[PDB]
């Protein structure tokens, strides 16, 4: 069978990945072989061990990546890599996996002889997955996005941040909670204080999280007054399309909000032909087994379309669906996805099945 070797395979989104390959039986279908960093199983700095693999998969990282990425291409080596960093998302022998959505441009790509295989931003996979169809019938001319993000976006010391910092933002005020008479502005006084003091950690995120919002993900680029987040948007999109030539513009703000692991995007697509809502619900309900149109109803959006409820789970529910004031050529759309899966290790998951078969 094909020998595959795994990096970073401890982290959080390395994690994901061996137990999703756990519950699928992946691992009776190819060699697998471990790598570690550590000094304290192969070296995942040892060039020679991993020129004799078939495929390379890692959730490692950009640094690792860069680092050893070159040095075993110098090699000759003829093998597949498949990465979940950003750091070869954009390089054009590489291509950005999501064969939900893009598995011709994924076959073309395997024939031409691509041998680097990039999972693609969390935001815009998941987009993807939920409003595929409309990308599909090429309905999509233009979209602007809000997106609820989630902590473990940036990582697993972000995610125990944010716990603390609901921790002690209640802690402030455990007493007078109790006590259903008390004052509520001297409540939100107190809590306000505690999240605004010199002890309420905010290291990881710069500023208080829990109980707030942070409208800045990532670093900016002086170039179109965006952050590479929402930067992404454009770029990725288009290159898992294919539409790198014919460039659809993704575009609007990126905030991190008070969730763990699930990303919600508020959407505002202009379309290119006033269709019946009730057809534009079809088109999205097909293109994928995942995707769940969640109708626009108050119990059940409120059952169904929250983190609270996709977490931890391959689900990807879509609602909130209708026209907006500015036109039928106009629709909005709201979506929850989980961040660990769709939007990272599920995308690697399955280009490597598709690899060792």
């Known amino acids: 069978m094909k020998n595959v070797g795994f990096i970073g395979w401890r982290g959080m989104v390395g994690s994901v990945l061996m137990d999703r390959m756990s519950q699928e039986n992946d691992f009776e279908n190819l060699n697998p072989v471990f790598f570690t960093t550590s000094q304290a199983l192969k070296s995942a700095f040892d060039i020679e061990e991993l020129k004799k693999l078939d495929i390379i998969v890692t ?33 054009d022998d590489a291509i950005i996996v999501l064969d939900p959505v893009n598995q011709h441009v994924i076959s073309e790509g395997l024939k031409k002889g691509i041998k680097t295989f990039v999972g693609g931003n969390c935001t815009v996979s998941l987009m993807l ?7 599909e019938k090429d309905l999509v001319e233009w979209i ?66 829990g109980g707030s919002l942070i409208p800045w993900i990532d670093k900016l680029l002086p170039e179109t007054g965006q952050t590479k987040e929402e930067w992404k948007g454009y770029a990725e999109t288009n290159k898992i ?78 609602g909130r669906l209708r026209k907006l004031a500015m036109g039928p050529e106009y629709l909005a759309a709201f979506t929850v996805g989980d ?13 490597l099945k598709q690899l060792v078969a």
């Open 59 to 91: 959730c490692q990282g950009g640094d690792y990546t860069n680092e050893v990425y070159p040095k075993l291409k110098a090699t000759g080596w003829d093998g597949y890599w498949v990465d979940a960093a950003s750091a070869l998302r954009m390089k």
């Open 129 to 135: 997955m939920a409003i595929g169809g409309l990308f």
């Open 144 to 209: 602007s996005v809000a997106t609820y993000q989630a902590a473990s976006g940036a990582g697993a010391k972000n995610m125990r941040e944010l716990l603390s910092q609901m921790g002690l933002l209640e802690q402030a005020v455990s007493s007078e909670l109790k006590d259903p008479a008390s004052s509520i502005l001297d409540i939100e006084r107190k809590v306000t204080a505690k999240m605004r003091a010199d002890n309420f950690p905010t290291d990881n995120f710069g500023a208080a999280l």
């Open 241 to 318: 399309l294919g539409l790198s030539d014919n460039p659809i513009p993704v575009d609007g703000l990126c905030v991190k909000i008070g969730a763990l692991r699930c990303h919600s995007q508020a959407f505002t697509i202009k379309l290119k032909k006033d269709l019946p809502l009730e057809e534009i619900e079809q088109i999205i309900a097909s293109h994928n087994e995942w995707v769940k149109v969640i109708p626009n109803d108050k119990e059940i959006t409120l059952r169904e379309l929250t983190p609270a409820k996709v977490t931890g789970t391959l689900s990807v529910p879509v």
């Open 339 to 351: 961040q660990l899966l769709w939007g990272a290790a599920e995308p690697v998951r399955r280009i």
